[PDB]
């Protein structure tokens, strides 16, 4: 399991988030052990791919900038209409 | 022939705050009208028979918390 | 089996409380006065009548109407009185067991019952027009219910 | 429940008016009040 990420720069307005979601991209955040909070973005279909393979409770090799961080998916918001994930939280696991 | 049994109300009482936080007041100025004590009297502030809060000296008004979930008003002298 | 770390840590009987009972008097004010006299004759502490704490539905009761009486025997004289009374009533009871096996509410309560039988053992209440059941309660200054039963087992019948 | 008039024996005027329940208090009521002619408290009695 290996997901790659991109760092979101400061202060996305709501139109930016809307365009971002109109792609296959998902806003997310990473926080926890040995790390400071970083706002990132992730592709939706690849995330579904790796989650269908590692399971709901599994470890991911998320790549953030130059680092790579073992991480676990803490929570996620989901739109019941439109059937699409809309936000994910990532938790560094030490 | 139908009618209603509801038709009545009482006149409104003009309760609530009467002076502002940070404003200068004179001796017996009314600061707050209420039923019961939603706000308690603090320093240099009295409480009337109808629970009215009023100043006892000249000074400036200060609303401020009392405990975890209570409030009070005070008046401080120099101004 | 005591194993007291210090003499200060030793379970002892805290106090004894005996209540006159219901004494519900619709027209038995004189009977209530007689029961007060009887309670005063039994133990050597001034008997204090009780009163209602609520208004029972479908009952001749309101807020007041002194239906009851309680006395608090905890002094050395009261302790000796209770001990001699228990020793005497043990003969007049005429029961093999004597007391229920599970009397404590877990905290160590006696909650013993009385049905006017051993009552007035000193002076036969031939003048009595009713029965005087009692409710003696013993206060255990001990946390463990089993240990409290074991302590009350000394000089006791259950 | 009626009105009553308390009267000062020496003052010579009736300057205290109060109320009473005739059923609970069929008697005439007395209390000492201040008379601003003697400059002191004196006993007042219902008429």
């Amino acid at each position: 399991a290996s997901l790659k990420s991109i760092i979101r720069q400061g202060k996305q307005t709501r139109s930016d988030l809307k365009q971002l979601r109109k792609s296959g991209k998902v806003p997310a955040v990473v926080y926890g052990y040995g790390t400071k909070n970083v706002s990132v973005k992730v592709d939706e279909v690849e995330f579904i791919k790796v989650i269908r393979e590692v399971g709901r409770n599994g470890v991911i090799e998320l790549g953030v900038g130059s680092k790579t961080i073992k991480v676990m998916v803490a929570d996620y918001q989901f739109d019941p209409l439109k059937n699409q994930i809309t936000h994910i939280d990532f938790l560094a696991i030490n | 022939v139908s009618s209603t049994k509801n038709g009545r109300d009482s006149e409104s009482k003009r309760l609530g705050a009467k002076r502002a936080d940070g404003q200068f007041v004179t001796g017996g100025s009314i600061l707050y009208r209420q039923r019961g004590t939603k706000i308690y009297p603090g320093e240099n502030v009295g409480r009337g028979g109808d629970d009215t809060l009023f100043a006892k000296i000249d000074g400036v008004v200060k609303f401020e918390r009392k405990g975890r979930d209570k409030k009070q008003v005070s008046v401080y002298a120099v101004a | 089996k005591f194993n007291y770390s210090s003499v200060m840590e030793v379970p002892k009987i805290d106090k004894i409380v005996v209540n006159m009972g219901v004494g519900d008097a619709v027209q038995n004010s004189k009977v209530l006065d007689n029961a007060v006299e009887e309670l005063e004759l039994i133990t050597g502490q001034k008997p204090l009548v009780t009163k209602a704490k609520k208004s029972i539905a479908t009952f001749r009761l309101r807020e007041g109407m002194p239906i009851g009486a309680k006395v608090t025997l905890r002094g050395e004289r009261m302790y000796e009185f209770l001990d001699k009374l228990i020793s005497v009533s043990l003969p007049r009871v005429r029961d093999f067991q004597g007391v229920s096996k599970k009397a404590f509410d877990g905290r160590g309560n006696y909650t013993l019952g009385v049905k006017e039988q051993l009552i007035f053992p000193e002076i036969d209440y031939d003048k009595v027009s009713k029965v005087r059941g009692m409710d003696i309660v013993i206060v255990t200054t001990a946390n463990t219910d089993e240990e409290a039963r074991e302590l009350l087992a000394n000089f006791g019948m259950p | 429940r009626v009105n009553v008039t308390l009267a000062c024996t020496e003052c010579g005027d009736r300057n205290y008016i109060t109320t009473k329940n005739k059923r609970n208090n069929p008697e005439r009521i007395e209390m000492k009040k201040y008379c601003p002619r003697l400059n002191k408290y004196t006993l007042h009695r219902e008429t």
Binding site: R56, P80 | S2, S3, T4 | - | -
Partner: protein, 137 residues
């Protein structure tokens, strides 16, 4: 049919219908359910009508849950009288559904039978619906 045993007030203001569904947006008791996609009132005659239609097609095989209850009374005047001499008398009980609210849930049958029974029930309701399954992922 379904109506509360007692309420504090018999004459209430009418609910707000704009917005999106506040809660109850997921299947939690069974395995299939009917999701609403438009907004309306459901009138407690429609609920019984749709439940009878849905429960007889399954031949008393599975279980049904109704995630909706009519809590609100609405009034109506007698036959077309003049305007305004007091509020009218109670006539029915309604529940307000907004897009995203699950309405029914079934379990204990095949996916095919569930699809058919929920389709049958959805034709008795004044709202557009959609067959959904218990979420995962």
């Amino acid at each position: 049919m379904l109506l509360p045993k007692r309420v504090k007030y018999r004459r209430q203001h009418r609910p707000k219908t704009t917005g999106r569904s506040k809660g109850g947006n997921y299947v939690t008791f069974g395995e299939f359910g009917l999701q609403a996609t438009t907004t309306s009132w459901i009138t407690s005659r429609q609920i019984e009508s749709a439940r009878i239609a849905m429960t007889r097609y399954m031949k008393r095989g599975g279980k049904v849950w109704i995630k909706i209850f009519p809590h609100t009374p609405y009034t109506k005047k007698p036959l077309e009288v003049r305007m305004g001499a007091g509020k009218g008398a109670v006539e029915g009980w309604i529940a307000v559904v907004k897009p995203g609210r699950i309405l029914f849930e079934v379990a204990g049958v095949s996916e095919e039978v569930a699809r058919e029974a929920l389709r049958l029930a959805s034709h008795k309701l004044p709202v557009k619906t959609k067959f959904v399954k218990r979420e995962e992922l």
